[PDB]
């Protein structure tokens, strides 16, 4: 289907102006004018063509080759001319199993017909003549190295279309711009033409004629745009200027803490005294100078989980000489653009700044599934991974000493640092048109070059989670990288993150670019500042099409509605933003509130505080504990219910006098208290909170 001979069809007589590059499954090398919609009528006249590939025969025999136009043809079989601007009967000997290179050149001045009707035939010894069947034809070896059986360059004999990097796309097309269009069986690669392609909404591709993969990744520019690629590669990374590579972190979903058995305690029949909590994990980004790492930070829920207000040590019966154990459920998360097949990266679980508690490893070459971009391992429809799995006897206990345990109780934070060891790559094979894991290809041989030759943009517009993409961008200091096309900031956002521009305004899923801020590392900042100066531009948002990206830039783009911590996780929002987001109330009663709150807003809240204010201005706080703010819940209808009864002993609010007020406040994550105060107070006193509802008793009704 993606197999056959590779054809270059030129409008000129001398192989200089390629109009179509495409493959044919069989010896029928025709392109009917019917298929030439994406090309100017006057360019539909092909005056020359070149085909290349291999022939593989199923049965040894003497064959004669012929075409539809032997008078206008020269054909080579492994360096040997077999057709020379004349028909013949010259039999060449071909043995089973062996691969023979084919090159065919065709020239015809002033054809009176558009397109090309051209067929390649052969006749065996039993005088059967037919168009060469698909099972006999293979593509050229369009790789950076030759195969054991398939040479990567064609014979030096005759015409060679300029293709300096051997990806299959002619030099001139990569530099000047090309488009890819799908017919029924085939993809046509053609020159970009403004008045034809711009309105069809087609993508204008440019790539380096000297880089087989312009993003320095393991898939060629041609493989990408023709679909000759792992189907798990992200759609945006089918662009030659967008890097395809995995990006993995670990998501911890929950945790259970328990007291370690010790030799001194013979009795193992005591009551369960474990501490189980939900956890929230986010991939982070620090802008630590020059970082290329995977890390996520885990927040352990501080809300009420057990009776009493005991310390963790009291709860678990942990004395100063005891040790504790941690178990947890996790999944791996691929937020990058290429899949992983046979090695999951190794992860350190870290307490505080640098106390490693555990090393989390999966079994090499024994993965239960692929870990695909925009997906999880295990998939979300399957159980997560327990750090100590019930099956294996050999899972190492994740242990903490007493002082570390107290530290975890106080910080309620863990960090997961994951390496970039991703194993082997599934590559396309031109011999059989299949994609398979290549044991000779490893991500560790690719990632450094990707990181060195691309600009990185990290964007949080999808659910406020950080997503990293890398886009091919010139390095003015590296001659090879100057052969890449100019990459603008605007173009990068379109191709890497799917920004569009319906009315001259760049948007991401309906949000104008101006709704996001720009943040740069030191070197990138100075670079962009210089560019703006050179442009006499005072506002980056009005010149995004004129700002050029360079290799090694780091750009961080964030939703402006939110406040961010040092890990660039969203942790709060302006009082005015939070207020407005709670303005539309659906229903109110002494039982609670029913609102429609933006999904992003909910992400930055830790909970709510409910208060009744009497006529003299005194306030009764109903859920007056730092661990009792979790009173909101998302309903199946998407609406949020704030539950007044939960921490009111299951009772609706009692409002003594209709003139009393019910006030509800939102508490953002950055303002959230996660421990009792120093003086031991567990109340909400002093919590910085945002009034989001205030009605008198007669208004609630
Ligand atoms: Ca090329
Ligand atoms: Ca290229």
XYZ file of C-alpha atoms and ligand atoms in Angstrom:
703
model
C 0.000 0.000 0.000
C 2.826 2.395 0.890
C 5.134 0.129 -1.118
C 6.219 0.290 -4.785
C 8.483 2.484 -6.947
C 9.173 6.127 -6.028
C 8.359 8.548 -8.834
C 9.407 12.106 -9.578
C 7.346 13.841 -12.277
C 8.745 17.065 -13.737
C 7.117 19.838 -15.777
C 10.419 20.623 -17.501
C 12.361 18.382 -19.871
C 15.452 18.029 -17.704
C 14.500 16.838 -14.209
C 14.682 20.310 -12.607
C 11.073 21.254 -11.775
C 9.408 18.439 -9.823
C 5.614 18.792 -9.752
C 4.705 15.481 -8.142
C 6.583 13.035 -5.963
C 4.654 9.858 -5.266
C 4.878 6.066 -5.187
C 3.055 3.425 -7.255
C 2.249 -0.030 -5.896
C 2.580 -1.745 -9.279
C 4.332 -1.283 -12.604
C 1.523 1.100 -13.509
C 3.374 4.379 -12.996
C 0.544 6.498 -14.384
C -0.850 9.717 -12.995
C -4.129 10.631 -14.713
C -4.902 14.363 -15.010
C -7.973 13.579 -12.891
C -5.617 13.328 -9.906
C -3.873 16.651 -10.604
C -6.286 19.072 -8.911
C -3.560 20.550 -6.684
C -1.425 21.651 -9.642
C -1.764 24.458 -12.265
C -3.270 23.210 -15.537
C -0.182 24.425 -17.402
C 2.067 22.467 -15.045
C 0.120 19.235 -15.571
C 2.270 18.600 -18.637
C 5.075 16.309 -17.522
C 8.100 16.418 -19.816
C 10.327 14.162 -17.734
C 10.174 11.603 -14.935
C 12.447 9.419 -12.837
C 11.546 6.261 -10.941
C 13.657 4.396 -8.411
C 13.381 1.383 -6.140
C 14.078 -2.341 -6.218
C 12.739 -5.421 -7.912
C 12.475 -8.733 -6.070
C 11.617 -11.856 -8.045
C 9.681 -14.834 -6.667
C 11.122 -17.262 -9.226
C 14.555 -17.315 -10.893
C 14.267 -16.763 -14.645
C 15.319 -14.707 -17.655
C 13.260 -11.526 -17.926
C 12.822 -8.857 -20.571
C 11.783 -5.386 -19.452
C 9.723 -2.929 -21.482
C 7.728 0.231 -20.914
C 4.912 2.194 -22.534
C 7.532 4.404 -24.188
C 10.835 2.602 -24.820
C 11.852 5.297 -27.309
C 11.760 7.951 -24.574
C 13.204 5.775 -21.834
C 16.481 4.682 -20.314
C 16.307 1.967 -17.660
C 19.049 0.575 -15.425
C 19.070 -2.681 -13.472
C 21.921 -2.693 -10.946
C 24.090 -0.287 -12.967
C 23.283 -2.147 -16.207
C 21.314 -0.400 -18.962
C 18.508 -2.700 -20.126
C 16.536 -0.132 -22.125
C 18.189 2.601 -24.147
C 15.762 4.860 -26.009
C 14.736 1.741 -27.949
C 12.641 -1.389 -27.438
C 14.420 -4.744 -27.330
C 14.292 -8.434 -26.442
C 17.452 -8.567 -24.341
C 16.902 -11.040 -21.500
C 18.578 -10.299 -18.172
C 18.999 -13.099 -15.615
C 17.327 -12.592 -12.216
C 17.617 -15.008 -9.283
C 15.008 -15.609 -6.575
C 15.350 -13.860 -3.211
C 17.858 -11.318 -4.526
C 17.137 -7.576 -4.670
C 17.944 -5.550 -7.769
C 18.085 -1.756 -7.960
C 15.896 -0.096 -10.574
C 16.258 3.351 -12.084
C 14.061 4.601 -14.909
C 14.378 7.916 -16.730
C 11.718 9.286 -19.103
C 11.771 12.380 -21.341
C 9.247 13.749 -23.844
C 9.083 17.320 -25.185
C 5.697 19.004 -25.586
C 3.320 16.174 -24.603
C -0.160 16.866 -25.963
C -1.823 15.203 -22.999
C -1.866 16.182 -19.319
C -0.604 13.799 -16.645
C 1.327 10.673 -17.546
C 0.223 7.290 -18.824
C 3.249 5.064 -18.280
C 3.612 1.378 -17.514
C 6.513 -0.904 -16.684
C 6.264 -4.436 -18.037
C 8.291 -7.582 -17.935
C 8.121 -10.865 -19.815
C 9.376 -14.165 -18.396
C 10.696 -17.215 -20.266
C 7.214 -18.656 -20.880
C 6.447 -15.466 -22.850
C 3.976 -14.132 -20.292
C 4.015 -10.327 -20.418
C 2.426 -8.221 -17.688
C 2.645 -4.942 -15.793
C 5.053 -5.707 -12.946
C 2.963 -6.777 -9.957
C 3.091 -5.105 -6.544
C 4.742 -8.076 -4.814
C 7.812 -7.464 -6.984
C 8.449 -3.772 -6.339
C 9.993 -1.983 -3.358
C 10.777 1.630 -2.532
C 14.336 2.946 -2.546
C 16.172 2.802 0.808
C 15.477 6.372 1.909
C 17.525 6.135 5.102
C 20.784 7.594 6.427
C 22.433 4.208 6.015
C 22.265 1.269 3.608
C 20.645 -2.044 4.497
C 22.456 -5.368 4.209
C 20.461 -5.976 1.026
C 19.378 -2.486 -0.052
C 21.816 0.294 -1.025
C 20.669 3.804 -0.029
C 21.873 5.522 -3.191
C 20.918 4.703 -6.762
C 23.488 3.930 -9.454
C 25.642 6.929 -10.381
C 24.612 6.078 -13.949
C 22.218 8.612 -15.470
C 20.250 11.402 -13.771
C 20.244 11.953 -10.014
C 17.544 14.216 -8.622
C 19.121 16.404 -5.942
C 18.240 14.873 -2.568
C 21.310 15.649 -0.443
C 19.919 14.044 2.754
C 18.321 10.989 1.110
C 14.900 11.423 2.668
C 13.216 11.297 -0.731
C 12.088 14.932 -0.974
C 14.017 16.871 -3.649
C 16.226 19.717 -2.341
C 14.249 22.385 -4.170
C 10.907 21.354 -2.693
C 12.191 21.277 0.896
C 13.616 24.784 0.568
C 10.829 26.442 -1.436
C 7.793 24.844 0.180
C 5.643 21.823 -0.552
C 2.218 20.415 0.138
C 1.002 16.879 0.658
C -2.362 15.745 -0.653
C -4.064 12.380 -0.375
C -5.611 10.568 -3.320
C -7.289 7.189 -2.867
C -4.242 4.927 -2.648
C -1.503 7.521 -2.618
C 0.010 10.728 -1.280
C 1.132 13.389 -3.767
C 3.919 15.685 -2.681
C 3.925 18.931 -4.706
C 5.240 22.532 -4.818
C 3.336 25.027 -2.680
C 1.323 27.505 -4.745
C -0.280 30.492 -2.972
C -3.435 31.064 -5.025
C -4.285 27.349 -5.033
C -3.331 25.971 -1.635
C -3.767 28.812 0.883
C -7.564 28.787 0.534
C -7.802 24.982 0.691
C -6.399 25.319 4.214
C -3.531 22.995 3.247
C -0.312 22.973 5.282
C 2.715 24.642 3.695
C 5.759 22.536 4.617
C 9.381 23.602 4.534
C 12.261 21.456 5.786
C 16.054 21.249 5.593
C 17.372 19.641 2.380
C 20.413 18.565 4.402
C 18.709 17.000 7.407
C 17.032 13.626 6.901
C 14.928 14.518 9.945
C 14.756 18.287 10.213
C 13.762 18.090 13.890
C 16.699 15.684 14.461
C 14.308 12.927 15.530
C 14.133 9.308 14.320
C 11.541 9.840 11.575
C 12.395 11.340 8.205
C 10.801 14.452 6.702
C 9.331 12.247 3.962
C 8.166 9.484 6.341
C 6.305 12.086 8.364
C 4.424 13.832 5.583
C 3.611 10.607 3.697
C 2.325 8.662 6.716
C 5.166 6.153 6.588
C 5.420 6.320 10.350
C 4.395 4.780 13.670
C 0.668 5.501 13.953
C 1.191 6.413 17.609
C 3.261 9.492 16.744
C 1.231 12.592 17.678
C -0.537 14.337 14.774
C 1.385 17.602 15.275
C 4.691 15.725 15.064
C 3.874 14.611 11.509
C 5.131 18.104 10.627
C 8.833 18.016 9.695
C 9.506 21.007 11.971
C 7.902 19.480 15.099
C 10.004 17.004 17.093
C 8.588 13.542 17.801
C 9.878 12.166 21.111
C 8.465 10.726 24.365
C 8.063 12.856 27.494
C 7.250 10.849 30.615
C 6.397 11.605 34.220
C 4.786 9.644 37.006
C 1.355 10.459 38.404
C 0.682 9.307 41.970
C -3.038 8.860 42.689
C -3.040 7.865 46.344
C -0.819 6.764 49.174
C -1.020 4.494 52.213
C 1.328 4.835 55.165
C 1.977 2.131 57.725
C 4.181 1.103 60.584
C 6.962 -1.288 59.694
C 7.062 -4.586 61.510
C 10.282 -5.059 63.490
C 11.955 -8.149 64.974
C 11.155 -7.032 68.544
C 7.383 -7.145 67.984
C 6.403 -10.818 67.767
C 2.656 -10.167 67.659
C 1.346 -9.339 64.187
C -2.354 -9.570 65.049
C -2.980 -5.957 66.078
C -5.647 -3.707 64.517
C -4.997 -1.911 61.245
C -3.557 1.541 61.917
C -2.647 2.770 58.455
C -3.090 6.256 57.030
C -4.590 6.432 53.545
C -4.842 9.679 51.584
C -5.604 10.884 48.092
C -2.799 12.619 46.236
C -2.608 15.140 43.402
C 0.397 15.095 41.074
C 1.511 17.607 38.454
C 4.372 17.638 35.991
C 6.540 20.662 36.792
C 8.948 23.122 35.156
C 11.451 25.141 37.129
C 13.421 27.323 34.738
C 16.449 26.038 36.573
C 19.111 27.201 34.077
C 19.357 24.792 31.135
C 17.198 21.968 32.511
C 16.015 19.081 30.347
C 14.425 16.770 32.879
C 11.214 15.004 33.848
C 9.821 15.757 37.281
C 6.482 15.796 39.017
C 5.421 16.990 42.462
C 2.872 15.184 44.616
C 0.535 16.935 47.055
C -0.810 14.699 49.814
C -4.379 15.588 50.780
C -4.650 17.360 54.172
C -8.398 17.036 54.599
C -10.112 14.996 57.336
C -9.639 11.238 56.884
C -9.712 9.732 60.378
C -11.532 10.281 63.677
C -9.903 12.603 66.234
C -7.216 15.213 65.512
C -4.256 12.938 66.213
C -0.728 13.286 64.853
C 0.327 10.740 62.248
C 2.592 9.068 64.807
C -0.258 8.822 67.326
C -2.564 7.469 64.650
C -0.101 4.772 63.599
C 1.402 4.120 67.025
C 4.849 5.180 65.863
C 7.451 5.821 68.558
C 10.764 7.593 68.010
C 12.624 4.361 67.246
C 10.073 2.956 64.787
C 10.073 3.174 60.993
C 7.172 3.694 58.585
C 6.380 2.325 55.139
C 4.758 3.963 52.118
C 2.753 2.292 49.364
C 1.017 4.131 46.530
C -0.795 3.756 43.222
C 0.868 5.317 40.182
C 0.682 5.555 36.416
C 3.195 6.689 33.850
C 2.105 9.652 31.734
C 3.353 10.376 28.208
C 2.843 14.047 27.411
C 5.236 14.016 24.470
C 4.830 13.190 20.819
C 6.235 9.662 20.357
C 5.459 6.283 22.010
C 7.572 4.056 24.225
C 7.717 0.286 23.645
C 10.261 -1.570 25.746
C 11.797 0.495 28.552
C 9.984 2.678 31.047
C 12.217 5.379 32.515
C 13.512 4.943 36.067
C 12.091 7.224 38.754
C 13.411 8.447 42.111
C 10.845 9.148 44.843
C 12.201 12.055 46.905
C 11.349 13.536 50.302
C 12.381 17.130 50.933
C 15.167 18.486 48.742
C 17.227 15.340 48.211
C 16.236 12.424 50.441
C 15.617 9.552 48.046
C 13.126 7.136 49.547
C 12.763 4.758 46.636
C 13.818 3.877 43.124
C 10.858 2.900 40.952
C 11.701 0.579 38.070
C 9.639 -1.446 35.591
C 10.831 -4.667 33.927
C 12.735 -3.992 30.692
C 11.302 -5.514 27.519
C 8.329 -6.823 29.494
C 5.845 -3.957 29.093
C 2.147 -4.871 29.136
C 1.309 -2.255 26.512
C 2.683 0.645 24.526
C 2.884 3.970 26.365
C 1.393 6.279 23.759
C 1.449 10.108 23.589
C -1.455 11.727 25.433
C -1.910 8.491 27.360
C -1.051 6.512 30.493
C 0.608 3.267 31.498
C -1.378 1.330 32.458
C -4.267 2.741 30.434
C -6.980 4.417 32.491
C -9.410 1.549 31.913
C -7.033 -0.782 33.808
C -5.871 -0.837 37.435
C -2.937 1.470 38.251
C 0.462 0.201 39.387
C 0.990 -0.329 43.111
C 4.546 0.480 44.214
C 4.491 -2.719 46.268
C 2.411 -5.016 44.078
C 0.518 -7.891 45.684
C 2.027 -10.399 43.257
C 5.819 -9.955 43.539
C 7.740 -11.009 46.632
C 10.606 -8.758 45.682
C 9.195 -5.242 45.917
C 11.445 -3.107 48.123
C 9.684 -1.436 51.107
C 9.665 2.315 50.825
C 10.765 3.149 54.331
C 11.148 6.351 56.304
C 12.710 6.852 59.693
C 10.796 8.707 62.400
C 12.196 12.134 61.583
C 11.500 11.675 57.863
C 7.949 10.594 58.672
C 7.427 13.810 60.667
C 8.853 15.751 57.729
C 6.364 14.147 55.332
C 3.508 14.960 57.721
C 4.602 18.590 57.771
C 5.360 19.107 54.069
C 2.746 16.681 52.697
C 4.842 16.719 49.519
C 6.892 14.211 47.541
C 8.799 14.612 44.279
C 9.122 12.106 41.443
C 12.234 12.567 39.284
C 12.127 10.454 36.132
C 15.038 9.877 33.756
C 14.971 10.040 29.935
C 15.739 6.336 29.295
C 13.023 5.319 26.882
C 14.432 2.324 25.013
C 14.027 1.365 21.363
C 12.203 3.126 18.558
C 9.649 1.800 16.078
C 10.857 2.866 12.625
C 9.520 2.451 9.088
C 11.136 -0.219 6.896
C 11.254 0.586 3.167
C 11.864 -3.069 2.283
C 8.381 -4.099 3.468
C 6.532 -0.884 4.253
C 6.034 -1.886 7.865
C 6.699 -0.155 11.176
C 8.452 -2.292 13.793
C 10.574 -1.788 16.901
C 14.184 -1.562 15.725
C 16.584 -3.058 18.264
C 19.357 -1.048 16.625
C 17.604 2.280 17.283
C 17.443 3.889 20.722
C 15.960 7.144 22.039
C 19.189 7.879 23.893
C 20.903 8.415 20.517
C 18.280 10.934 19.434
C 17.211 13.031 22.417
C 20.437 15.052 22.772
C 20.291 16.246 19.150
C 16.612 17.079 19.463
C 17.347 19.157 22.540
C 20.280 20.948 20.897
C 18.576 21.880 17.629
C 15.054 22.953 18.607
C 13.299 25.728 20.490
C 11.207 24.516 23.415
C 7.751 25.922 24.148
C 5.951 24.805 27.314
C 2.215 25.674 27.219
C -0.541 25.122 29.801
C -3.653 26.005 27.826
C -4.834 22.410 27.932
C -6.287 22.023 31.420
C -3.543 24.098 33.090
C -1.142 21.189 32.885
C 2.330 21.837 31.490
C 2.865 20.402 27.975
C 6.268 20.664 26.315
C 6.860 20.758 22.564
C 10.043 21.299 20.573
C 10.173 22.937 17.165
C 13.065 22.927 14.666
C 14.719 26.357 14.751
C 17.834 27.873 13.256
C 21.080 28.066 15.182
C 22.859 31.017 13.559
C 26.189 29.590 14.761
C 25.803 26.067 13.328
C 26.082 25.951 9.540
C 23.894 22.840 9.141
C 21.134 24.304 11.274
C 21.069 27.414 9.072
C 19.720 25.239 6.249
C 16.459 24.968 8.156
C 13.569 27.265 7.371
C 12.911 30.336 9.495
C 10.600 29.496 12.374
C 8.411 32.284 13.733
C 6.792 32.321 17.166
C 3.372 32.484 15.548
C 4.075 29.536 13.240
C 5.461 27.463 16.138
C 2.305 27.947 18.171
C 0.147 26.926 15.200
C 2.042 23.770 14.267
C 3.092 22.599 17.735
C -0.017 23.420 19.781
C -2.780 23.825 17.211
C -3.334 27.550 17.603
C -5.438 28.843 14.724
C -6.307 32.295 13.399
C -9.866 32.605 12.063
C -10.085 36.421 12.005
C -6.489 37.591 11.906
C -6.309 36.799 15.613
C -4.219 33.914 16.866
C -6.246 31.744 19.265
C -6.031 28.471 21.149
C -9.433 26.793 21.232
C -11.230 30.124 21.325
C -8.887 31.952 23.692
C -6.917 34.822 22.153
C -3.146 34.571 22.442
C -3.276 37.724 24.596
C -4.978 35.623 27.302
C -1.616 33.899 27.908
C 1.675 35.364 29.143
C 5.228 34.866 27.829
C 8.092 33.835 30.072
C 11.655 33.308 28.822
C 14.931 32.012 30.215
C 17.737 34.554 30.463
C 19.345 33.919 27.083
C 15.984 33.703 25.302
C 14.773 36.895 26.952
C 17.754 38.916 25.761
C 17.394 37.410 22.300
C 13.693 38.347 21.981
C 14.267 41.796 23.479
C 16.899 42.438 20.802
C 14.524 41.277 18.078
C 11.752 43.558 19.309
C 14.231 46.434 19.365
C 15.331 45.658 15.786
C 11.660 45.585 14.765
C 10.905 48.872 16.570
C 8.130 46.925 18.237
C 6.903 47.671 21.728
C 4.405 44.831 22.048
C 5.253 41.188 21.316
C 1.616 40.218 20.660
C 1.333 42.354 17.550
C 4.498 40.955 15.925
C 4.405 37.229 16.596
C 4.831 36.544 12.859
C 8.084 38.525 12.908
C 9.740 37.039 15.995
C 12.169 34.271 14.991
C 12.855 31.256 17.154
C 16.392 29.897 17.549
C 17.682 26.528 18.706
C 17.968 26.163 22.477
C 15.381 28.849 23.276
C 13.039 28.121 26.178
C 9.618 29.746 26.170
C 6.916 29.252 28.800
C 3.333 30.283 28.009
C 0.681 30.337 30.748
C -2.997 31.159 31.219
C -3.076 34.723 32.653
C -6.089 34.024 34.864
C -3.954 32.154 37.357
C -1.185 32.576 39.914
C 1.708 30.088 39.659
C 4.163 28.589 42.117
C 7.897 28.074 41.516
C 7.087 24.750 39.778
C 4.740 26.595 37.421
C 1.722 24.769 38.793
C -1.457 26.904 38.977
C -2.136 27.624 42.649
C -4.480 30.604 42.731
C -6.141 33.484 40.909
C -7.039 37.154 41.438
C -9.863 37.857 43.883
C -11.776 39.490 41.039
C -11.394 36.413 38.833
C -12.516 34.014 41.568
C -15.474 36.240 42.503
C -16.671 36.542 38.910
C -16.345 32.783 38.409
C -18.811 32.143 41.254
C -21.287 34.873 40.270
C -23.978 32.757 38.603
C -25.809 30.831 41.305
C -28.290 28.196 40.161
C -29.733 27.440 43.574
C -29.212 28.387 47.207
C -30.645 26.937 50.416
C -29.743 26.248 54.033
C -28.307 22.997 52.660
C -25.785 24.608 50.306
C -25.047 26.290 46.978
C -25.364 25.064 43.397
C -23.175 26.877 40.877
C -21.582 26.572 37.460
C -17.832 26.990 37.950
C -15.190 26.888 35.167
C -13.187 23.631 35.283
C -9.921 25.583 35.491
C -11.159 27.559 38.518
C -11.986 24.391 40.468
C -8.402 23.277 39.871
C -7.012 26.166 41.936
C -9.354 25.830 44.934
C -8.704 23.661 47.987
C -12.137 24.253 49.468
C -14.704 26.610 50.948
C -15.493 28.199 54.281
C -19.116 28.744 55.360
C -20.049 31.384 57.909
C -23.204 32.878 59.411
C -22.915 36.564 60.264
C -25.301 37.988 62.868
C -26.766 41.476 62.976
C -23.938 42.909 65.101
C -21.327 41.672 62.660
C -20.196 38.617 64.591
C -19.397 35.511 62.588
C -20.082 31.865 63.299
C -17.796 29.657 61.171
C -19.601 26.411 60.418
C -16.690 24.278 59.153
C -14.028 25.907 61.302
C -11.078 23.555 60.770
C -8.213 23.627 58.273
C -8.930 19.989 57.370
C -12.670 20.551 56.918
C -12.769 22.769 53.817
C -13.412 19.961 51.336
C -17.140 20.620 51.038
C -17.488 21.044 47.265
C -18.133 18.342 44.706
C -18.588 18.198 40.950
C -21.937 16.781 39.851
C -22.619 14.534 36.863
C -24.340 17.508 35.245
C -21.053 19.396 35.564
C -22.390 21.774 38.200
C -20.729 22.277 41.588
C -22.489 21.704 44.897
C -21.134 23.382 48.017
C -22.389 21.273 50.928
C -23.301 23.221 54.087
C -24.356 20.049 55.899
C -21.153 17.964 55.557
C -19.419 19.516 58.567
C -22.532 20.753 60.322
C -23.311 17.356 61.882
C -25.360 16.504 58.791
C -27.710 19.413 59.606
C -28.850 22.310 57.389
C -27.741 25.756 58.562
C -29.864 27.147 61.374
C -30.411 30.826 60.739
C -31.836 32.434 63.895
C -32.984 35.658 62.279
C -33.790 36.241 58.558
C -31.508 39.279 58.656
C -28.484 37.103 59.449
C -26.117 36.564 56.525
C -24.745 33.372 55.054
C -21.274 34.038 53.674
C -19.301 31.508 51.644
C -15.589 31.985 50.925
C -13.286 30.226 48.483
C -9.778 29.215 49.594
C -7.132 28.932 46.872
C -4.310 26.395 46.975
C -1.612 28.999 47.587
C -3.565 30.197 50.617
C -4.343 26.740 51.916
C -3.229 25.735 55.426
C -2.018 22.136 55.571
C -1.017 21.758 59.235
C -2.174 22.955 62.608
C -0.608 26.344 63.390
C 2.504 26.610 65.583
C 0.311 27.308 68.623
C -1.570 24.112 67.778
C -4.759 25.800 66.583
C -6.552 23.750 63.922
C -9.209 26.396 63.147
C -9.618 28.543 60.013
C -8.601 31.681 61.862
C -6.301 33.770 59.684
C -6.856 31.828 56.458
C -6.781 34.144 53.473
C -10.141 33.534 51.814
C -12.252 35.101 49.062
C -15.906 36.028 49.601
C -17.889 34.467 46.758
C -21.452 34.422 48.094
C -23.266 36.561 50.645
C -27.044 36.594 51.062
C -29.369 37.272 53.969
C -31.586 34.474 55.265
C -34.693 35.910 53.596
C -32.849 35.996 50.239
C -31.759 32.366 50.430
C -35.185 30.880 51.155
Ca 15.670 15.637 0.735
Ca 15.142 16.872 4.782
